[PDB]
Amino acid sequence: KLPVPWPTLVTTLVQCFSRYPDHMKRHDFFKSAMPEGYVQERTISFKDDGKYKTRAVVKFEGDTLVNRIELKGTDFKEDGNILGHKLEYNFNSHNVYITADKQKNGIKANFTVRHNVEDGSVQLADHYQQNTPIGDGPVLLPDNHYLSTQTVLSKDPNEKRDHMVLLEFVTAAGISQGEELFTGVVPILVELDGDVNGHKFSVRGEGEGDATIGKLTLKFISTT
Amino acid sequence: KLPVPWPTLVTTLVQCFSRYPDHMKRHDFFKSAMPEGYVQERTISFKDDGKYKTRAVVKFEGDTLVNRIELKGTDFKEDGNILGHKLEYNFNSHNVYITADKQKNGIKANFTVRHNVEDGSVQLADHYQQNTPIGDGPVLLPDNHYLSTQTVLSKDPNEKRDHMVLLEFVTAAGITHGGSASQGEELFTGVVPILVELDGDVNGHKFSVRGEGEGDATIGKLTLKFISTT
């Protein structure tokens, strides 16, 4: 059984599948970094609770876009909204604000996730994010803009193990040869190795992304 | 294109597809009214703007669950968020609070929909809802409870008409007690085809929408594509 609520892992579990409108395609750092990819690092501060630190490698492995993550979580309260499993099984729309990191040749992002709590309150998860390209080639450093997200979480009736089904749509707003790798439907593999409060777990996800419409379709299975 | 934003029509465009947990099946008015169906009437008041009045007939026509709606919108302002198309193309999660309407032999509901606006603010839409059975059979009058919703809106890249692709999950909650509680429940054991037809007029601008898809009430899932028909 997952030691934390599935919604708290959503943002950690491939922004290269965001739909950048034609007038913004010169601002799409994520696709410009492919195929070598990028390292995505976050600190996620759950207000009045613990923190996640994550480091992920996002790159192509042949035809598959892979997101391989290490997650370390600490300082969660036993009676809080996370370890107490008080979060609703849903996900709000967020705006992910992106700025260029002209020192690392990459980007930073900042946003605050709002997790609905079963008692009507909101649990904030403040995200600080930095992405650095792995490859040598030129990448696109964007003007300030944001990604606008939508996500629904469900369960596979035929699935038996602890799992999460996710459908997500993301479009860029607010204003490369790598992008040519995203013209069709691309298979996705996500692998997460986690430790929260000393509770170790793993998550494996598979699905597909369609960047032409900003769509992600994934099923995640836990192991503990 | 439609004269109003697609998100403002989401709630008007089949709560019989909500997942009612087994311990709450006695509270599912919507399925109990089937197959004869129910009339669903709403007043939707947009804060600092106009209002929609809707009357829908929701019933089975053969194998298909049909939602046929008349919508009249009045008193909208030209520079507002609706006629000015300033709403984000998304839809927030809501709780729909349902209570028995014993004096109408049905149910009523109150909730506020929060439409995100492009400038970062919110457009509130106060919903009042009344559902009355069409048929003569016995219906289930529920205890107070709510429906919890999740919805995503998207587009079909090969569709030139104004349209909205929708996926929704809804589950009932708020009762803690714990077969089929109505004969109409039996009609929703499978995946049911859905037809939605909306005839609208907002501030004198006439339009229409047709949607088709499927609903799976055992998991609470709705999958539909809506297209402008005028």
Going from the C-alpha of B130 to that of each of B30, B96, B98, the distances in angstroms are: 12, 12, 10
CA distance A94 to chain B (A): 10
Q: What CA–CA distance (Å, rounded) separates B59 from A149?
A: 34
Residue A6 burial (C-beta neighbours within 10 Å; 0-12, 13-18, 19+): buried
Q: Which residues of A touch B153 (CB under 8 A)?
A: 150, 169
Q: Tally the C-alpha atoms within 13 A of residue B120's C-alpha that lie toward its C-beta.
A: 3
* Within a domain: A15: yes
Among A30, A40, A209, A193, which residue's Cα sits nearest to residue A131?
A40
The beta strands (E) that lie in chain B are given as 38-46, 51-61, 64-74, 95-101, 106-116, 122-133, 145-154, 163-173, 191-202, 205-216, 221-228
Give the resolution value in Å. 1.5
Segment holding A67, helix H or strand E: strand A64-74
Tokens coding A97: 């604000």
CA distance A136 to chain B (A): 34
* Within a domain: B156: yes
Going from the C-alpha of A105 to that of each of A37, A43, A212, B194, the distances in angstroms are: 13, 20, 25, 50
CA distance A178 to chain B (A): 22
* Within a domain: A13: yes
Q: Which runs of consecutive H residues, i.e. helices, occur in chain A?
A: 29-32
Q: What is the CATH number of the domain that holds B77?
A: 2.40.155.10
* Within a domain: B1: no
Please give the tally of structural domains in chain B.
Answer: 1
* Within a domain: A1: no
CA distance A200 to chain B (A): 30
Amino acid at A141: L
Q: Tally the C-alpha atoms within 13 A of residue A202's C-alpha that lie toward its C-beta.
A: 5
* Within a domain: B106: yes
Q: What CA–CA distance (Å, rounded) separates B148 from A209?
A: 27
Q: Which B positions 12-51 lie with beta carbon below 8 A of chain A?
A: none
Three-state SS string across B161-190, please?
Answer: CCEEEEEEEEEEECCCCCCCCCCHHHHHCC
Among B123, B70, B125, which residue's Cα sits nearest to residue B96?
B125
Total residues found in chain A within this entry? 224
Q: What CA–CA distance (Å, rounded) separates A94 from B129?
A: 29
Matching residue, tokens 């809802």: B129
3-class SS of residue A105: coil
- Rounded to the nearest 5°, which phi and psi values hold at A171? -130, 145
Determine, for residues B154 and A116 on separate chains, whether the beta-carbon distance falls below 8 Å.
no
A210 contacts chain B (CB < 8 A): no
Q: Which B positions 101-120 lie with beta carbon below 8 A of chain A?
A: 116
Full residue range of the structural domain in which residue A27 is found = 6-224
* Within a domain: B90: yes
3-class SS of residue A66: strand
Q: What angle do CA A126, A127, A130 make, to 5 degrees?
A: 155
* Within a domain: A199: yes
**CB atoms near residue A26 (< 10 Å):** 14
B150 contacts chain A (CB < 8 A): yes
CA distance A65 to chain B (A): 23
- Mention every residue, 6+ apart, whose C-beta is less than 8 A from residue A74: A50, A51, A196, A197
Contact between A42 and A67 under an 8 Å Cβ cutoff? The reply is no
Residue A119 burial (C-beta neighbours within 10 Å; 0-12, 13-18, 19+): exposed
Give the number of beta-carbon pairs within 8 Å between A and B: 46
3-class SS of residue A217: strand
Q: What CA–CA distance (Å, rounded) separates A206 from B205?
A: 46
Contact between A167 and A186 under an 8 Å Cβ cutoff? The reply is no
Longest Cα pair distance anywhere in chain B, in angstroms? 53
Matching residue, tokens 């999740």: B150
3-class SS of residue B22: helix
Most B-contacting residue of A90, A114, A118 (CB-CB within 10 A), to test interface: A90
Q: What CA–CA distance (Å, rounded) separates B227 from B230?
A: 9
b (16+ CB within 10 A) / e for A138-175: ebbbbeebbbbbbbbbbeeeeeeebbbbbbbbbbbeee
CA B167, A191, A31, A42 torsion-angle sign: positive
Among A9, A147, A161, A214, which residue's Cα sits nearest to residue A91?
A9
Q: Which runs of consecutive H residues, i.e. helices, occur in chain B?
A: 29-32
Amino acid at B58: V
Q: Which runs of consecutive H residues, i.e. helices, occur in B36-184?
A: none
Determine, for residues B152 and A150 on separate chains, whether the beta-carbon distance falls below 8 Å.
yes
From which experimental method does this structure derive? X-ray
Q: Which residues of A touch B154 (CB under 8 A)?
A: 169, 213-215
Contact between B122 and B7 under an 8 Å Cβ cutoff? The reply is no
Amino acid at A205: G
Residue B158 burial (C-beta neighbours within 10 Å; 0-12, 13-18, 19+): exposed
β-strands B95-101, B64-74: how paired?
A: unpaired
